[PDB]
Design a protein around this ligand. Structure first.
Ligand code: ZN
Ligand code: ZN
Ligand code: ZN
Ligand code: ZN
Ligand code: ZN
Lengths: 76, 74
DNA sequence: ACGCTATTATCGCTATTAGT
DNA sequence: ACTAATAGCGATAATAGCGT
């Protein structure tokens, strides 16, 4: 089944299965438990979000390859 | 039987005091001279957010190094 | 330093919204 | 309808961190 809804609570509160006061930047829930730096809200749908991560992973992966290449050239 | 993982830093637990929980290192064990030995345990409901935080920080540093190397190569 | 129980977070389970 | 996603309550397992 398709997921068109964009959750209003933060990702962590969702995972922890507890009510999110949904304050921004970070919710009190996360600030309280000390994970405010991990608190964030979804802006796109599950699917758009999945794609985005795939792109970022590939970008990340290729950059590591490139850097290795350059470092290897700076001492060949 | 649940899987409750402690939230404060390893030391404060060990000592049994209240952890201000500040990140990356709490004031509790910054006052006692061990700041950079202060770390927290990984919560399962934080793996993903955590993994995503490394990825971002790393994509960030790699872009700074690629430029730094591209120059040092001339 | 730590024993010890008041404080506090987990996740089975109830409701409810919404894809087909 | 049927029931996959969501929201998240709350009994209570367990950590939290106070006070000896
Ligand atoms: Zn939240
Ligand atoms: Zn949050
Ligand atoms: Zn601490
Ligand atoms: Zn440090
Ligand atoms: Zn600490």
């Amino acid at each position: 089944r398709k997921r068109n809804r964009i959750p209003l609570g933060c990702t962590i509160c969702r995972k922890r299965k507890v009510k999110c006061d949904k304050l921004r930047p970070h919710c009190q829930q996360c600030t309280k438990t000390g994970v405010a730096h991990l608190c964030h809200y979804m802006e796109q749908t599950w699917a758009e979000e999945a794609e985005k991560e795939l792109l970022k992973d590939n970008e990340l992966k290729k950059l590591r390859e490139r850097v290795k290449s350059l470092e290897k050239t700076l001492s060949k």
